[PDB]
């Protein structure tokens, strides 16, 4: 098959650096007509993607000289001399050249903050829940950078990973730093044969895990 | 230049998913329309592309069950695909094939479609109280289908609030947000958590209260 590599997955910038993505194709995406079918595009949240570059070079309408394309064959490259806030989002490149046209997997261009670590808040069931037949523990991890994180949960300090559901929010608007929630579910029956419930959270900003826990008592 | 789509939105699996684009300001017989959808799972995927001269071309992983046709005259292009599965779930689009450069350029908005056998349910709202700073929060459990809003007293607290993507369980959307707010203002003042379920027409409003 036609496989599209994008590189890097995320790219971290500061506004006014230089960026340059990169877009690899398991094939020559040079077409039996002479041209080179492949594009970039921008994608911003809530949006549909949008066209920068068609044809390796070519900057499509309204689209700032800052941004260019080159490369040729197999490899690809968009570059932005000078990164601002609205170019910010998902860069995808898309190749029409080889039928099915496909999409690389996309770059995220991401704005770059200090490190920061977790705020880590753990809750136990409400008994509201417990009184409907459930139990669910929940933990938020809010306000970090970077977004790679790791978290972990302890039931009488053993290690569970079945019946955890982890959702993560978007770089964040105003401080640009990333929140998890991590849900840990268990039936009624499990909560209440055990006491010790621990979330712990490893990020780079702490050699040591931060770790919060509670006793159902 | 203007796309439209036009979707059913909630689709049953095993069933059939129609769409039609609606185009204006140029002609279907100058342009050809491609359908690409979007989901989190498989990214941006090309389903397959209807030629201003009216042939197609499909995606050969969906062409068993994708169909794609236009009435030039009405400046419309039917989507149809049959057998739907849940992981077909996702934002469909149609745009527009720039000619000889082969890239889409006009978008229409795209149309949201979730594929699943769930019926409407209202979500169960859970507070979350602590078993400087205090952070609160709030499990909404349980609701189909997406999406549920939730607000902090209302919508009068809305800094140090984090809403985070639902997730699927059991079929069932569950989704949590959690609140910041200095310990100096929980619980003297009143904290609530306030979640609104367009589609089973509900509104919870939860106070959040010091456990035991």
């Known amino acids: 098959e036609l496989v599209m590599t994008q590189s890097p997955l995320s790219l971290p910038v500061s506004l006014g650096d230089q960026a340059s993505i990169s877009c690899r194709s398991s094939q020559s995406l040079v077409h039996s007509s002479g041209n080179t079918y492949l594009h970039w595009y921008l994608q911003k949240p809530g949006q549909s993607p949008k066209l920068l570059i068609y044809k390796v070079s070519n900057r499509f309408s309204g689209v700032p000289d800052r941004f260019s394309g080159s490369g040729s064959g197999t490899d690809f490259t968009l570059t932005i001399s000078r990164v601002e806030a609205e170019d910010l989002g998902v860069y995808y490149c898309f190749q029409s050249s080889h039928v099915p046209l496909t999409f690389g997997a996309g770059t995220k261009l991401e704005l770059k903050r200090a490190d920061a670590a977790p705020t880590v808040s753990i809750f136990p069931p409400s008994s509201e829940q417990l009184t409907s037949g459930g139990a669910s523990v929940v933990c938020f991890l809010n306000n970090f950078y970077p977004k790679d994180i790791n978290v972990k949960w302890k039931i009488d300090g053993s290690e569970r990973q079945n019946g955890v559901l982890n959702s993560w929010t978007d770089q964040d608007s105003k401080d640009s730093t990333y929140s998890m929630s991590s849900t840990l579910t268990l039936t009624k029956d499990e909560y209440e044969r055990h006491n010790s419930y621990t979330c712990e959270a490893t990020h780079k900003t702490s050699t040591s895990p931060i770790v919060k826990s509670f006793n159902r008592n | 230049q203007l796309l439209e789509e036009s979707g059913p939105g909630l689709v049953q699996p095993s069933q059939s998913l129609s769409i039609t684009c609606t185009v204006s300001g140029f002609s279907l017989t100058s342009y050809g329309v491609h359908w690409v959808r979007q989901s989190p799972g498989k990214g941006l995927e090309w389903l397959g592309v209807?030629?201003?001269?009216?042939?197609?071309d499909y995606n050969a992983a969906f062409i068993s069950r994708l169909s794609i046709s236009k009435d030039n005259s009405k400046s419309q292009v039917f989507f149809k695909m049959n057998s739907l599965q849940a992981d077909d779930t996702a934002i469909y689009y149609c745009?527009?094939?720039?000619?000889?450069?082969?890239?889409?350029?006009?978008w229409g908005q795209g149309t949201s479609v979730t594929v699943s056998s769930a019926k409407t349910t209202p979500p169960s709202v859970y507070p979350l109280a602590p078993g400087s700073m205090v952070t609160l929060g709030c499990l909404v459990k349980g609701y189909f289908p997406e999406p549920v809003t939730v607000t902090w007293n209302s919508g009068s607290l809305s800094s140090g609030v984090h809403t985070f993507p639902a997730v699927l369980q059991s079929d069932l959307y569950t989704l949590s947000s959690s609140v910041t707010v200095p310990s100096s203002t929980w619980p003297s003042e009143t904290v609530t958590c306030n979640v609104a379920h367009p589609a089973s027409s509900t509104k919870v409003d939860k106070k959040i209260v010091p456990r035991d």
């Open positions: 209807i030629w201003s001269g009216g042939s197609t």
């Open positions: 745009a527009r094939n720039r000619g000889y450069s082969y890239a889409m350029d006009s």
